[PDB]
Amino acid sequence: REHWATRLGLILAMAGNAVGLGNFLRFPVQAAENGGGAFMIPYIIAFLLVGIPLMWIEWAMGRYGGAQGHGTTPAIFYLLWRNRFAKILGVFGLWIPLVVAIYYVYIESWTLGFAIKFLVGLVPEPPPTDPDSILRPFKEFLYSYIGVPKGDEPILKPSLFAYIVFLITMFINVSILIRGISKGIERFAKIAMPTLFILAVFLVIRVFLLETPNGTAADGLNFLWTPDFEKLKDPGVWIAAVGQIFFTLSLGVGAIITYASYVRKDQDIVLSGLTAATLNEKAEVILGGSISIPAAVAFFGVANAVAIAKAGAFNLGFITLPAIFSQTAGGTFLGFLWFFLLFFAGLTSSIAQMQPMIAFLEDELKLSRKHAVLWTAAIVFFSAHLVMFLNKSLDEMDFWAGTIGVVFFGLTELIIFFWIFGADKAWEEINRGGIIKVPRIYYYVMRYITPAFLAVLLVVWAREYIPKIMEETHWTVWITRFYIIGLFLFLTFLVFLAERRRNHESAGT
Ligand SMILES: CCCCCCCCO[C@@H]1O[C@H](CO)[C@@H](O)[C@H](O)[C@H]1O
Ligand SMILES: CCCCCCCCO[C@@H]1O[C@H](CO)[C@@H](O)[C@H](O)[C@H]1O
Ligand SMILES: CCCCCCCCO[C@@H]1O[C@H](CO)[C@@H](O)[C@H](O)[C@H]1O
Ligand SMILES: N[C@@H](Cc1c[nH]c2ccccc12)C(=O)O
Ligand code: NA
Ligand code: NA
């Protein structure tokens, strides 16, 4: 069974896992829609009571399960909890990361398509100066790439270039994954993370130099880092902060677990985990938070920046930022550094999203890595056509897989590992072989605070958001729900087959 060759490589893979589009696209938007500093306070609390505790749990389970020749939650849950239901609950450990990949890798291919276009300088050019007049050419640039429907029909019509770029993006993903953990994920991680960090730092440094009558990037930084206690009372920001912490650290997806299942039985996870997490957070709060927002505040001011943030998840990064850059010296090339950055950020994450599926086919169905990778790619590529052609389908998958799903699963694995499997055995399995030990206080957070914190949160989310689901929405949302539900059924079947092959290979040996 493959292992991480070096400690550094492991850290970088785990950090490349968490450091993605969420750091440079999602965080700024989330931080802005919530008043900046108002969002930061709950964000810090979430990182301590949730982000970190659960972080160690997933490493513990990954390494615990990895020892016994398993890298996925269906099998691992069964080990921590010998029950047929524990295997069915573990199916999400394959479903969630697989669903996320379906739309994530597509957004990833965008950054690749923009990077290329920007490199060759095949971009729009606004005349020298109205915000709408300069932004419009960029909106039209994105809407033409992904093929936003002009007509009432909710149908997307992506360009030939966009479609092929997706093929390439998938191909690049496969080329890395087909090499395995050390030769592939780890090898690429070492080169990708440093590069990423360099690009980010350069962009942050370059962004600061932005200066206009409307303001400066210095103002924007004061907006996000200004603590406001008035908004603290609202649950909206708490749910936003905790949802972001989950997405950024990649928790409740089962991806961290698969990666960690390649860590050696006694090898440290306490420090290793802590570090990789800290790397993501440092990159998110410092690097990701200093580019998008400060640039918009500079060129547009705060109020209008928040307006742009609330406008869309891609508006800031795919339209505004490139437009803001097109006004600066060497903006187009700077746009290429931006999208190239994103592409490496997403690529290190998309490979981690497909690894659980790859690990399952290998560990449980005894498929060669070559076959495990090609079929997984085939499933992701095929499934992605829904996201590419069916308007709003992307939104749907992100809500269930990357939003509601990851929290439900976070509480599940936490309960199984600590409550069912035993709180003390979990503690040993976590601290065992740890270069350092987990603070005794976190023992109580894990067993009591985190699950209660999550439980209450989920209920609150259910009380206000549940009415919305199926109450009123376009019927096309069912096309996505129908498919992703079928995805779960298909994954349940494989689990069923994996348990049956296990039975024959027991009597025959
Ligand atoms: C490569 C796999 C076979 C093609 C999958 C069938 C659907 C893709 O269809 C393709 O969509 C593109 C974007 O709309 C168009 O530009 C292409 O002309 C069209 O062939
Ligand atoms: C890394 C670059 C990938 C190859 C780029 C191929 C996509 C561009 O293809 C172009 O698409 C246009 C719109 O459909 C057509 O008008 C052109 O005839 C066609 O060459
Ligand atoms: C919804 C998931 C499946 C989407 C696949 C759509 C395949 C595209 O379908 C074809 O696209 C052509 C453009 O290249 C159009 O000219 C044709 O009219 C259309 O049949
Ligand atoms: N964590 C990545 C994106 C992501 C979300 N869930 C994941 C699950 C597995 C791998 C990556 C992810 C980011 O910060 O942008
Ligand atoms: Na990444
Ligand atoms: Na992240």
Nearest CA owner, ligand 2 atom 12: 160
Ligand 4 center–CA 348 separation, angstroms: 9
Q: Is the CB of residue 389 below 6 angstroms from any atom belonging to ligand 3?
A: yes
- Within its chain, how far is the Cα of 483 from the centroid? 21
What does the block give as tokens for 459?
A: 């209920």
Atom 14 of ligand 1, residue of closest alpha carbon: 158
Our answer on whether the CB atom of 331 is closer than 6 Å to any ligand 1 atom is no
Q: Which of 144, 160, 164 to mutate to test the pocket of ligand 2 (most atoms within 8 A of CB)?
A: 160
Beta-strand ranges (E) seen in 188-228 are 211-212, 215-216
* Distance in angstroms (rounded) separating the CA atoms of residues 213 and 221: 17
Chain centroid to CA 489: 24
Distance from C-alpha of 451 to C-alpha of 481, rounded to nearest angstrom = 28
Distance CA 219, CA 379 (A): 46
Cβ(158) – ligand 1 distance below 6 Å = yes
Task: Tell me the C-alpha distance between 388 and 107, whole Å.
Answer: 10
**Segments in 153-269 forming alpha helices (H):** 160-177, 187-208, 217-224, 235-249, 255-260
Ligand number, closest to the Cα atom of 116: 2
- Ligand 4 neighbour 22 (Cβ under 6 A): yes
Asked if residues 124 and 141 have their Cβ atoms less than 8 Å apart, the reply is yes
Q: Which amino acid is at 473?
A: T
Contacts of 326-333 spanning 24+ positions with Cβ under 8 A:
326/123, 326/124, 326/125, 326/126, 326/134, 326/138, 327/126, 327/129, 327/134, 327/299, 328/210, 332/118, 332/121, 332/123, 333/118, 333/119
Amino acid type, 112: L
Is 369 a known ligand-binding residue? Answer: no
Probe target for ligand 4 pocket from 349, 350, 403, 406, with the most ligand atoms within 8 Å of CB: 349
Given a contact cutoff of 8 angstroms between Cβ atoms, the answer to whether 145 and 110 are in contact is yes
Ligand nearest to the CA of 155: 3
* Ligand whose nearest atom lies closest to the CA of 197: 5
Q: Ligand 1 in contact with 157 (CB < 6 A)?
A: yes
C-alpha dihedral sign at 81, 86, 89, 93: positive
Q: In whole angstroms, give the CA distance from residue 438 to residue 98.
A: 31
Which method resolved this structure?
X-ray
Best probe residue, ligand 2, of 141, 145, 161, 168 (max atoms within 8 Å of C-beta): 161
- Closest to 110 in 3D by CA, of 384, 396, 374, 476: 384
Residue with tokens 């492991």: 10
* 212 strand-pairing partners: 215
The structure was resolved to a resolution in Å of 2.8
Contact 217, 210 (CB under 8 A): yes
**Cα–Cα separations (whole angstroms), residue 65 to 14, 53, 264, 355, 376:** 17, 18, 11, 15, 22
Label the pairing between strands 215-216 and 211-212: antiparallel
**Residue with CA nearest ligand 3 atom 11:** 157
